[PDB]
Symmetry: C3
Subunit: 151 residues, 3 copies
Amino acid sequence: ASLRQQVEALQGQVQHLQAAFSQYKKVELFPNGQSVGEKIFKTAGFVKPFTEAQLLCTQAGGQLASPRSAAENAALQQLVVAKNEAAFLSMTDSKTEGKFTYPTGESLVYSNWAPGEPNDDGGSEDCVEIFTNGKWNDRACGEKRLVVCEF
Amino acid sequence: ASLRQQVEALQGQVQHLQAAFSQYKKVELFPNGQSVGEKIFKTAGFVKPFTEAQLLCTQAGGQLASPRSAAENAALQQLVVAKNEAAFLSMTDSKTEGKFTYPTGESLVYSNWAPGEPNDDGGSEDCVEIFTNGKWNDRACGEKRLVVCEF
Amino acid sequence: SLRQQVEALQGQVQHLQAAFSQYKKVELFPNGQSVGEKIFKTAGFVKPFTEAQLLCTQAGGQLASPRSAAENAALQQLVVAKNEAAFLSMTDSKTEGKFTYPTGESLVYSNWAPGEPNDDGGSEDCVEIFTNGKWNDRACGEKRLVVCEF
Ligand SMILES: OC[C@H]1O[C@H](O[C@H]2[C@@H](O)[C@H](O)[C@@H](CO)O[C@@H]2O)[C@@H](O)[C@@H](O)[C@@H]1O
Ligand SMILES: OC[C@H]1O[C@H](O[C@H]2[C@@H](O)[C@H](O)[C@@H](CO)O[C@@H]2O)[C@@H](O)[C@@H](O)[C@@H]1O
Ligand SMILES: OC[C@H]1O[C@H](O[C@H]2[C@@H](O)[C@H](O)[C@@H](CO)O[C@@H]2O)[C@@H](O)[C@@H](O)[C@@H]1O
Ligand SMILES: [Ca+2]
Ligand SMILES: [Ca+2]
Ligand SMILES: [Ca+2]
Ligand SMILES: [Ca+2]
Ligand SMILES: [Ca+2]
Ligand SMILES: [Ca+2]
Ligand SMILES: [Ca+2]
Ligand SMILES: [Ca+2]
Ligand SMILES: [Ca+2]
């Protein structure tokens, strides 16, 4: 009977919440975040070696930036450009040299290697950095790079 | 019948979100945000020339700080004071000298000019900065000022 | 038709719950910590006690006030991450030797380093927490990491 009115009432609160949430999300991502589809990149704004970077992201309930399409890569590139610091991706070929995988162990479904890469320089480049131009380069995991997590 | 129970269950989930979100709004706005009415100012925490500052805000889905009332201007001032750095506003008289407009092209509905301003010093001041005392001054767009966006 | 509107409302709420949960993770990284119903967040810079206290209150919160081992460990994470000791909210400004919260009540938990509090130089009324989580009374005029709780 009057249930129709409890429906409309709830409709109002939900919609006011949707509106405030949309506003607060835009505010949240400025200036250190970028959303693309259902994924959100956020940079910590400082550099760390791979192991440390990876730990910061996992402990925060996410993982290191893992661009899976050209659209995701471009979104990530924006933060790298904004900070003017190359960043680590999540992917490594530590298990089997030459075969880059995501943290889950799955093979890459997208790549944006710079010309000549990956080249395993010095016989010891198992992590991946993304440059300000959005291209990728395998690099030693001990180097320090911008920390960007995805959620 | 069962529809009544469903609506009641949603009401409880909504209440939970509302309370939880209320807390996160405060957390998020600390220390670089300022809420006033339905507007939110947030500083990027660094300085840029007007053109770069404007692009940052627009690409983030907002625009440069545009106080439209004394209340908004006072809220913006609080951030500026806290960061101890003058900030750009969105408004310019780049189109017609002496006529300041918002990015939308509409004339100012509020202003807080320091005495004697705007004065187009050197014949080349088309942007606007807000001081820590909350007053406005027209200024060369090439200068670097604190980036504060509104959402 | 009411049952169809309820279904749409159900969808909206499930979507909001999922988005809010994702958003919380984003907000807390890298400067916040959630413990129980409390959230610590660092401003990422240092200030003297009075200015730090003002920043927190103006933002609708207060300075870090760990009231249990669990809260202290969470706060400790931010301190370690920034590698900067932080001010707590508590002081014995009113009565030497009796530390109190901003409300005025006495401490209900403490984690003092060995030998502390010692009012060194006869003038230490504020509290700092080290990277090791232990507390030391310290001069309020020193500059320490600002960490608020909400
Ligand atoms: O240091 C490992 C790195 O060396 C080479 O790249 C270097 C240089 O040639 C490049 O111009 C700059 C800018 O990209 O980076 C390094 O200084 C390459 O062999 C590269 O594959 C390798 O990872
Ligand atoms: O330099 C442009 C600026 O010059 C004059 O303002 C001076 C001073 O009075 C102001 O407080 C500071 C603020 O940064 O700038 C100058 O030092 C005025 O002519 C002013 O209108 C003008 O924009
Ligand atoms: O007066 C400041 C402070 O001095 C002493 O503590 C110092 C040092 O002894 C400790 O190793 C480190 C711990 O990280 O803290 C200070 O640097 C103590 O006398 C202490 O009570 C006092 O507040
Ligand atoms: Ca290898
Ligand atoms: Ca390799
Ligand atoms: Ca390489
Ligand atoms: Ca002009
Ligand atoms: Ca002018
Ligand atoms: Ca001027
Ligand atoms: Ca004393
Ligand atoms: Ca004392
Ligand atoms: Ca002491």
